[PDB]
Structure formats: C-alpha cells, structure tokens
Design a protein around this ligand. Sequence first.
Ligand SMILES: [K+]
Ligand SMILES: [K+]
Ligand SMILES: [K+]
Ligand SMILES: [K+]
Ligand SMILES: [K+]
Ligand SMILES: [Mg+2]
Ligand SMILES: [Mg+2]
Ligand SMILES: [Mg+2]
Ligand SMILES: [Mg+2]
Ligand SMILES: [Mg+2]
Ligand SMILES: [Mg+2]
Ligand SMILES: [Mg+2]
Ligand SMILES: [Mg+2]
Ligand SMILES: [Mg+2]
Ligand SMILES: [Mg+2]
Ligand SMILES: [Mg+2]
Ligand SMILES: [Mg+2]
Ligand SMILES: [Mg+2]
Ligand SMILES: [Mg+2]
Ligand SMILES: [Mg+2]
Ligand SMILES: [Mg+2]
Ligand SMILES: [Mg+2]
Ligand SMILES: [Mg+2]
Ligand SMILES: [Mg+2]
Ligand SMILES: [Mg+2]
Ligand SMILES: [Mg+2]
Ligand SMILES: [Mg+2]
Ligand SMILES: [Mg+2]
Ligand SMILES: [Mg+2]
Lengths: 158, 74, 341, 120, 319, 102
Amino acid sequence: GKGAAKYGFKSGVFPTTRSILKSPTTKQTDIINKVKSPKPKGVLGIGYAKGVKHPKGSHRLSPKVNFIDVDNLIAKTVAEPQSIKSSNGSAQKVRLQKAELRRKFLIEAFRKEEARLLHKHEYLQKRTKELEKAKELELEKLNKEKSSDLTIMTLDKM
Amino acid sequence: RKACRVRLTNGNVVSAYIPGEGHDAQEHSIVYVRGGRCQDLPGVKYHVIRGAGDLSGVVNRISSRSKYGAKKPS
Amino acid sequence: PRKANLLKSLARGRVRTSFNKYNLFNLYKKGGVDLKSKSLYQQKWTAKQETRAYHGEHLTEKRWQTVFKPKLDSVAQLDASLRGGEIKETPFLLQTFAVLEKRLDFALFRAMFASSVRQARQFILHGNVRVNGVKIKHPSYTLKPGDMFSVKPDKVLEALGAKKPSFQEALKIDKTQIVLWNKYVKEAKTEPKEVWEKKLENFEKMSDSNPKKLQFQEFLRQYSLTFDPKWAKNLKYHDPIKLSELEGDEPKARKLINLPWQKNYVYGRQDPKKPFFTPWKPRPFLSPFAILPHHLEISFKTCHAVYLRDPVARPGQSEVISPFDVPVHERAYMYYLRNGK
Amino acid sequence: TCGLVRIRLARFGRKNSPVYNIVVANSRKARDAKPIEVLGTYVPVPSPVTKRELKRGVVPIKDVKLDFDRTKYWIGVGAQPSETVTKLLRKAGILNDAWATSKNSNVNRKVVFERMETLE
Amino acid sequence: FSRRRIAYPFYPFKKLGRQHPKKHDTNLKTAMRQFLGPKNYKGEYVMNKYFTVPTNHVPNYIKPDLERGQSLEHPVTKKPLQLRYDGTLGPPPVENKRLQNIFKDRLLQPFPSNPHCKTNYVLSPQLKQSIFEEITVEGLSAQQVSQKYGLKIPRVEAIVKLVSVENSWNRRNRVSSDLKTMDETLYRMFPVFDSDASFKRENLSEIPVPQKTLASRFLTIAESEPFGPVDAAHVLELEPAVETLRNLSTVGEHSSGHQQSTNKNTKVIYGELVEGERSQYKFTNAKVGKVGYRYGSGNRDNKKDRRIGFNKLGQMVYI
Amino acid sequence: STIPKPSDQVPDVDAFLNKIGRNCNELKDTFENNWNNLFQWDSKILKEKGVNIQQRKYILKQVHNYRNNRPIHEIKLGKKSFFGGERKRKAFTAKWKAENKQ
RNA sequence: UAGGUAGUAGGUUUAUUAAGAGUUAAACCUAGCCAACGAUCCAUAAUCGAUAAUGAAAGUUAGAACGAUCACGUUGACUCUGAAAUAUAGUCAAUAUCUAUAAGAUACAGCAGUGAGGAAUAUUGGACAAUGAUCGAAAGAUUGAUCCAGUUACUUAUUAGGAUGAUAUAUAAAUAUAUAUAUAUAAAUUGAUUAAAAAUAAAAUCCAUAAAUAAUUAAAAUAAUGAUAUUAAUUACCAUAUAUUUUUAUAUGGAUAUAUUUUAAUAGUCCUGACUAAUAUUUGUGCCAGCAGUCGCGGUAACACAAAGAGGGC
Ligand SMILES: [K+]
Ligand SMILES: [K+]
Ligand SMILES: [K+]
Ligand SMILES: [K+]
Ligand SMILES: [K+]
Ligand SMILES: [Mg+2]
Ligand SMILES: [Mg+2]
Ligand SMILES: [Mg+2]
Ligand SMILES: [Mg+2]
Ligand SMILES: [Mg+2]
Ligand SMILES: [Mg+2]
Ligand SMILES: [Mg+2]
Ligand SMILES: [Mg+2]
Ligand SMILES: [Mg+2]
Ligand SMILES: [Mg+2]
Ligand SMILES: [Mg+2]
Ligand SMILES: [Mg+2]
Ligand SMILES: [Mg+2]
Ligand SMILES: [Mg+2]
Ligand SMILES: [Mg+2]
Ligand SMILES: [Mg+2]
Ligand SMILES: [Mg+2]
Ligand SMILES: [Mg+2]
Ligand SMILES: [Mg+2]
Ligand SMILES: [Mg+2]
Ligand SMILES: [Mg+2]
Ligand SMILES: [Mg+2]
Ligand SMILES: [Mg+2]
Ligand SMILES: [Mg+2]
C-alpha cells in the first residue's frame, strides 16, 4: 500500500535488530562526558531546582547509567578454562572444541561492536566538521559580489 | 403489472416485481428476492429472480436468457 | 489470447500487423481515421478501435489495460541548439503502444522473421525461437537492450516466401505452361521475323527493373543483332501432360517436364521436402510492409537480430512503427489513461 | 535441537517452490512467526547447468545469503542450530567438525574442491 | 454524432450495377478486384504495382492518395494502366503529376497517414566488415567507430555481435542458397546507409530525458546575470547533460572508459565439494535488516499485477 | 552403493526380512532370496513391485544400516497406552474402574 | 444521556507484592475530583501494518488472505503448582448429553465430517520425503503442526493454429528463357438491385505444435530416506566420436524396412433511442403484452416491447 513508500517501497517487515552491547561502553568517552555534564535548570531545565523538595519516597536524581567494560564483560561471560584439563574422552574433546569456538566468536563480537561504535562516533564528528566547512564555503560564495549585482537596484543608505 | 408480497427469511415482508412474460408463482411458492425497484409501481422496491426456487424461467425466452432464467436451447 | 475472428474484414477496414493480401487493401483504401463531427467519447472510441486493431489485437482488453504504462520515453538531442535548422516537434504520443515492442512476438514481426504477430506467437510457442541461445517458448517474454534472438531459418523462409503449391495444383499450372509454350514455338516457326522483332522491342522497355534483359544479352552472346533462322528451327515443342496418367506419381511427373525455365521439377516444387515454394521467391505484396526497424539490427543471412533499445520518440520521428497519425494515438492515450471512462 | 534460542529455517515461497529464511527464533514460536532475527536466506533448488556446462565441468550451485558476523554472535551466546542449519554452517566454514554427527560424519570421502573464500 | 460506416474506398471506383441474382457480390469485393487486377492461372497479380518487390534499393510503399487508387501498371514497362468502359486495361487519359516528383521523405514513409514513421537504412556488407575489423583487429573503440561512420554505439556493438555469428555460420556452411537468396532480396529493398551523407548519419548527442527535469522551473535573476547549462544542472541537482552523454558513450563493451570493479567487495565462500555431492554451496555475505524474506509482505498472486519472471532455462516462473 | 556381504546372523534375504520385522517377511516372494536385489533395488523399483510406502522406506533404512555395520534388529512402532490415548484416558479409565473393580 | 462521583479526589500509616499506587484490606484526616473542547450513561465494535481496495492527492473503506497485538476454548467464580495461569488444569456451581450410576464422563472456536441457520464457503484424502515441535544417551518413536493432493472459475496468470484462400470444367503446334494467357460452357447459399451486405467468412490447399506413443529423466535430499508421482523437462530409432555462443554438422556402434512413431483444433454472455461503442433492413404486438440505471418506450411506418437479419462490447 501507500504506506510502503515511507520505507523504500519495501513490503513487509523485519524483526528489530538486537544490540550486541545493551549499554554504552566505558570507551565511549563522548557519552560519558554528556552524562557527567551538569543538568540544566529553568525553562528548559531537567531536575529539581535547589530548594524544591522532591516527593517523599522518590529519588531526587535519575539512576546512574551503567557503562559496560568490555574487558570485564569478556572475563565474566566467556572466561577461559582455568586448567588445561585432560580431554582424553571423545565427548570431552568435542566439548572442548565447541567451547573454544564459541568463546572465540563471542569475544570477536564484543570487540568488533565496541570498535564499530567508536569508529562511528569519529566518522560522524569528521563528517559534521566537513559539512560545516562546506556550508561556510558555500555561504561565502553566495555572499561574493558579482558584476551582475550592479544591475540590482539598491537603497543601502535608507 | 404482476407483483407479489413476500415474507423474507429475516421476517421482513416486501413487494417484489415478477419480470418476464408469464409466471407460475403462487402462494407458498419459494422465491428468491433481489434488489431493484419497479419505477412505475410505488412501493415495489425488489425483484424476484426468474429460474430460482419455485419460480421457473420465462417460457420460450430467446434473448437475454440469463436475465430470465432460461437455459440455452440445444 | 483473444481468438482471431474476422481480422481481415473489408467492411470494418481494420489494419493488422500482417502481410496478408486482404490486410493490404484495408490499408490502401483507409484514407486516414475520421474524427470529425464526433463527441470526445466517440473520438476516443474510434481511436481505440483503430489503434488496438493493429497494436496487440491478440491481447485481451483487461490484460492490455494492466500492461499500459502512462509514462512515455523520449530523447533530448543536445546538439539541436548547435545546428540552426528549424527544429521539429517530438511526437510523444506515438509511444502509447511502445511497451508492446519489447515483447518477443512483436520483436519477431518487426524483424520480418514472421509474416504477422499471430504467426510470430506460433513460431515462439512451437520451439523455433531462441533468446541469447536459450529456447524461449512464451510469446510474452520481454527483451532487454542488447539481447539477441534467432529464429530457425526454415520458419523465416516459410514466412517471407511464396506458398508451396500442392502437387495437383502445380500439375495444372505445368499443363497450361506447356500449352502456352507450344503456342510460342508455333508463332516463332510460322513467322520467325515478326517474333524476333517483337522480342527485340520488348527488351528496349525493360528499364533495368527487369533483369531478364541482362540475361538476354548473354543469350545473344551464346549464338549486330541480326535475325537467325537457326533460332526458330532450334525451338522444339514440349509434349502435352495427361493429368490423369501422372496423377499421384510425382517422380514420373517431374521426369516428363522439361521447359526452358522449369526443368525436371513441377511448378513451385523443386524440392517438395522444403516447407515453401521452391525455388525460393518472396511472398506476394511484400514491398508495402517491408519496413526496417530503427530499434533492431537484423542479420537476415543467419536470421539473427539484436534488440538495440526500446523504441523512442525524437524530433520529427517515432521509432514505434504505426499506420496511424499522432492525433489518433493521442485519443487512444486519453482513453487508456482513464480506463475508458 | 535444544535450548530456547535456535537457528532454524522458516519456510517462504509457494507450494512446490520452497524458499527459506535462516532465522534466530524462540523454540516455542511458530515456524513462520516473525523471529528474533533473520540471518539469511536458503534456496534449496540448485541452479540448473546446461548440457555444455555439464561436460565443461560446472557443478550446480545452491545459493545462500548469510550475515557471517551476526551468525557468529548468535553461536557465541549459545544459540542452537538445527541439523539442516548445522550442515549449512559447517559448509560455510563457520562451524567445524565438532558439530558433525555419527550418521553424516564424512571421515573418509575424497575432497574434490576445497572451501575457497573470495571477493565478488 | 457517430454511426457505423462501412470502410468504402476514399477514392473513386466502379460500383456494382444491376447484378444477376446469384452473384451475391459486394461493393467492397469488387473494389478489391479492381485494386488487385486480374489473377492469372498461376495465382499471381502481375498488373498490381505492389505484387513484386523492388530491386533498386528504393522501397515501393503504397501511395493511394497520390495515385488516387490506381494501383495497376504494366508488369514490364511499369506504365500506368487504368480500367475502361470495355472492362479492359489501358493507358490513362491524363498523366498523374503527383506521382512523378515525390519528396524524398515520402519515399521512405511506408504509411500514408503517419509521416513520423520512416524506414531505417540497411548497412552494406562492406561497412559491416570494416566495423568488425576495426573493433576486433585494429582495436578501435566503439566511440571512435560511432563518431566515424555516424552510427549509434549500440548499433556498432550489435554489428560486431552479428558479424561474429555470420562467420561461424559461414565457417560451418550453414548459410544455404535460400538464405542467401532471401538476404539479397531484402537488401535490395531498403535504402543503403551512407556514412558520408550527412542527412543519413544518426544523431550522436541523444540522452534519455529524466523525469525530475521534465517539469518547468523558472528563476528570476538579475538582468545581466549569466546562467548556463552547468548552473541549470546545479539547480536541478543533476550531472551536466554533457557529462550524461559522455557516461552513456562509455557503456559499449568495446567502448573506452568501460569499467566495473567497485562491486568486487562482497565476501563470498564456496563450500567444500566432496565426491558424490551433486551440488556446491555458495555463501554470500549479507547484513541483518536487509537480507531475508520480509514478514507480512503483500501477496499479489491473486492480483492482476502478479509478478511473472523467467529462469535461466527460459521457463515461466512466479516471482 | 556397493553390495555388502552375507553374514552368519543374516545369511540370506529371508533371514534379513525376518530380523527387521514389521511384517516384512511377507515380501520374501518379491525379492526371491536374491541378495543383490535387496541391495540394488531403490524406492522406484520397489514401488513398481507393489511394496507399500511404509514397508519400502523401512527396508531401505535397514539396508543402509546393514551396509554400515549398524544393527538391523526390529524396532517396534509406538502404541497407545492400554488405558487409551491421553485425550481419552480419563474417560476410559473411569469406565474401566467401574466395570472391573466396581 | 447533563449533571456525575462517595474509595469517590487528595493526605498520613500499616498489611500485602520483587516492585510504585485507594491496586486490595484496615485505621485516621482534608473536601475534593470529572464535566458543553461532552462528564456519567447507553448502544455498537476485537485492534493494527512496510496488508488489501480506491483516489491526482489529502483521505476514505476493509481488517478475509500475509504479519503484529489482545481476548477466549460451553458459562461463572475460586484455588493449587509456577518466574509467569483466576490455566482448554483442579474445585464448586450452571446448561446440555452420555453410561459405568459414580461426590462419574463428555462440551470439535485442533483436523476431517454431520445436522441446523444462510444468498453463500471444500475431503470423514496422502505422507512424515521436506521445514519445524516433543520424548530419548543413542537407535529411534510421535506429530490432522506442517507438507502435499482432493473439492470449488472465488481471484490471478499462461495457453486454447498459423500462412494461403472467392468457382468448376473443356479449351490451344503436331528447347537463344515463354509470359499482362485467351476463349467458350456451366454453376453460383441468406439478404439485397448497389455504396447492402452476410463474406476471407466457409470449404479447400500448405506447414506446424500439443496430446498420444516410445526412450529418457532432473530437482525438491541426502549418509540414507520422495508423500506429491503415472514428477517436471527433454528427446523423436538408442548409443558414441569429432568438429560444432547457442546451435549446427559429419561420421560412426548397435536398431527397423534407401529411408525411419503418430498427429489434432465447434465460446459464451450482454447490448445496438439519448447518456453510451453499435445505419442494412424486416416481422409480430397495438397504452395490451411487456421494457426501464436516468430521461422515458408501447394508442397500426415501435431504432426502446417480443423476434429475424446486420452490428457493438467484454
Ligand atoms: K496500466
Ligand atoms: K458522551
Ligand atoms: K474463514
Ligand atoms: K517430520
Ligand atoms: K458477441
Ligand atoms: Mg535431546
Ligand atoms: Mg452511438
Ligand atoms: Mg499505600
Ligand atoms: Mg478505585
Ligand atoms: Mg479504607
Ligand atoms: Mg462482538
Ligand atoms: Mg482504518
Ligand atoms: Mg474498524
Ligand atoms: Mg481465517
Ligand atoms: Mg482462559
Ligand atoms: Mg471461561
Ligand atoms: Mg477450567
Ligand atoms: Mg463447542
Ligand atoms: Mg471442524
Ligand atoms: Mg438452509
Ligand atoms: Mg494423518
Ligand atoms: Mg434470395
Ligand atoms: Mg508431446
Ligand atoms: Mg531418491
Ligand atoms: Mg431487454
Ligand atoms: Mg410494427
Ligand atoms: Mg436501451
Ligand atoms: Mg428490442
Ligand atoms: Mg441475430
């Protein structure tokens, strides 16, 4: 139907893509700074102003964001076997191989995701600065005086 | 103009026009009623379907047979 | 598809995508589409009647309505402004039926590999057509720019060639040919001088449209152009044909026939195994319809063609081959835009 | 297959022309219910090779589209592939011979072509 | 106002008079016999000026308006013949001036009522070999051969492809006498292409007309401000039209600039093939959110626009 | 594939058809005690010989087992409980405890 | 439907819960809360989409099919287990039926099917081969999920034969190549007497393919397993070699009597006064019979009723 136009004329839907990292990581410095930044007050403020009692039984401030340390996530989730156990059995050998592959996959997934997030922030910052510079250049060309401008009547003094 | 008073299976009683030349409709005959009024007859807002129920098709109808429940001659 | 009924009716005078004799007269005598005195609906209906008769008559109206595309494609010449000659208006509305030209069956007709779109469909359905080396048996297959398609040579010869006469039909033509040959040998022998004088005068009005004069010059070199009594004497009378005696026996019949032009074979049956008139000659009335398309490059030696592009409209020209003028196509476009409302 | 998170085929297409989505799905949901994620597609019907190609030595190809990175993540978090999906992942080189079974173990069968990773 | 109108000839013809009761003839049928002329014992119409094909590279297209329905001529002298009161054919009383000086355009126009339809020019067997030998042996680019002979690049590429098929056919003796006879006949029916003739040369500056540009935008600028094609292109947010023409000339397989490598960046895996396996698995890297069959997509099978395609074997398949 | 060799437990086709069970001893005349026929005939041939769907699939599964040195002992198809299927067990049991033990 | 509300609106405290809260229960306070931008009440309805229909579009409509969400599994309440259930469980009661007559069992809104209701909606089918689900260490077992087939023009799509074709006889000396073949005689269906047609329509002629027949035979699935299935497709004596975009072509080994299986083509339905495409006319009826979406038609030359001819749509 007409609704598909809003989505590239794609008919039907896909499930929402899950996020490998469910919270920001401790290496996303940009996010860490924003949360630490003092919260505004006044017309566009957020939070209880000094001297304004908050409701009894409620937390005055918002809960602190949980930042994921990927090194700690990897250590707790896919920890390595502490000893090199004797996998002489056929089933023990199969299990050891499967555990090794599963651990390799999930460690690569967490480290590729963190890299992607950090690489995406840098790319956006570079792209925005470029766009800003291009806009200034474009605007400067617009403001440049051309010879045709002499034929546009003006009353600058008035 | 030949018409008929009919009690529909939903309890509504209507007046239906019987189209075609000649009909074999009587009291207690099972008829099927469709929409469509008889313009010159006020209050006759429906038509009975020829060739359905106990109402036979028009006898010896040659043209527009499907509108009068007449089967194709061999 | 729609059943083919009364396609070549003279009273209706509809023009079809065919080389048929009756379809040539309908086109010859048409004299344009009359749109005067008609209301807008009547004008649109008439335009629809005429155009659809030619462009895809075998398609059902409901199928055509789905296929119909409101968007028409033209080209912009970027040098027009750098020429200086009076520019011509592009006939945009002659692209109304361009969507059909990419169909395989239409492509075959435009390539002159079939005598009509109907025949093209049967060639495709019977397994005689290949696209890019793959046998395609669906007339509705759509070609893309660059595609190459081929048709079995025997089918193209049967479509562009004369009809093969039957043995009985061709055996009565040889009987008459022998009688009219023995009349030329009786007039050449009774008064040889007049016949040769008439023969020389005929060769003066040939105009070079008749290659027989070129061949005749060879014959005069095989024997100043002065009379020779040896000619009349050389002439011999062929023997009459008893249709009953040699009836049902072709080898016998093709051994009793030996004419100066047709030797040891019945008229049109030089090779009865071939599916056309032999020796091969063009079908009658081929010139009026023999149109070379701008959107196909054809190789008749191999019966191969390449689909260069979808037909386009350009200043003063439309690549969509049509017997109808732009005003008619404009009305047809107006009808289908609104689904005949 | 066990667990709550399984990698399995969901059937699409028409009668007599099956195509499949490779999906991560909750074990209890319907086979064709909207899954957790769609990892790829599997077309079971091999591409037909022409007479010449056959003599030329072309082998019919079954085409699979798959997100390699995302598939590895779901194996990492303990998703359990179905038997058919397991065969596909072992052929792709994502899973190894540890996922083979006694019935399909090709311990002794000659390799005619070795897995080749290319760019196209 | 509209009524059914029997398609009588627009030109004058001899209508039926009093008829014997068993003839059961029609005025349309008698008008056709007058157009066709007598039919000989061989089933031919030698008196009709369209029965036989032209052999001088000049199409013989119908000209009913200019000849006023007189289609009969002497089969050898090509001199007009018309029907007389006796029922015989003889010279016309007055020559037809409309048939002696025909415009060049009309000669190539097959249909009287459509002057926008013209036949194309046939390429000579020599020019085709020259084009074939220049692209293949000398190694010229299709852009060069196109700009030299005045042929559009797609036509140039088609000639090379077709000449290759004619060599294989001639190398295996597949071109029979009938095919040669037919080819020559059809060659002598069309006007031959002349690369030198400027009017015969194909325009080489044509570009597809986009849709966003089809609208008419107008800008009010200073009276002495220059505005040119490049400025217009920026306003319409399209590449300059000259650039479009140049990019369309580098599309030919033998044309300069033809390049296709930016797509060779998709990881593909070819599964191991073991003895006895009847097929090989090919894996193509994709991205979650793009790959897969969508859920709840519109079913069109029961709709008039149901998608129909064709597989590699040419078999009709539902998409 | 290849033709396995007769063993001591399964000397001939008749012994093979008796060990697998599932009433497959009623096809002894279809095979004619020909060892090669049992190990060469595929489903299409067996269908032409009148073997029904269930039996021909079962034979082919046991032929594959034999070729791979896996046991061919009969495995029985499942059967409903004596007290009936789960959906009709409550009703059946109630009527069986009032007609046996009262 | 104009007033509604009385745990009602708010405050404090305890109980209960993993958890806030008049959410429930208990206590004590304040007099609030909602409402003509529609409260309260009544009626009606499962909701929605990147789904379907329509339109230039904003929108409108549907909510069958595909998918998402909710609710329910004859009716009501309650309890147990559990992370989660007022569970298609259990308990009690209600309604109905049944047999074993018990503080009994059953409730087809699972599949198929039957009666009923209705204008109207299908098989008491096949298979677990595929994809899934449950149980099992495995071998495997189970699966009316599911996959297939059946019924039904309900919808869509493809195909459902092309080229040629206005007559038949008799007719004509006794090979530098002819050629506008020409004469007689008979025949010629409906309508009509010429712009009145039916009609290239038919037959006939040429050439095909489908089906059949024969051989062959994928793919769905492989370690093996095929319900569908008398598989699709291909090939036309079969096999082989060489050359050979395709394809073609030659020649070979076996195979029949120099040739090699057979061979087609019976559409309906509505309409022709105007709107609205339908000019070739004619008969019956006579404000009757009837037609009609709108205007209207029919009272003896009816373009409108009932028909023949011809014609126009799909
Ligand atoms: K359309
Ligand atoms: K209200
Ligand atoms: K339903
Ligand atoms: K199963
Ligand atoms: K009709
Ligand atoms: Mg298990
Ligand atoms: Mg009209
Ligand atoms: Mg509280
Ligand atoms: Mg309350
Ligand atoms: Mg209280
Ligand atoms: Mg309801
Ligand atoms: Mg809605
Ligand atoms: Mg609604
Ligand atoms: Mg339903
Ligand atoms: Mg419930
Ligand atoms: Mg309940
Ligand atoms: Mg309950
Ligand atoms: Mg019930
Ligand atoms: Mg049921
Ligand atoms: Mg009923
Ligand atoms: Mg069953
Ligand atoms: Mg008569
Ligand atoms: Mg066949
Ligand atoms: Mg098999
Ligand atoms: Mg009527
Ligand atoms: Mg009258
Ligand atoms: Mg009317
Ligand atoms: Mg009437
Ligand atoms: Mg009639």
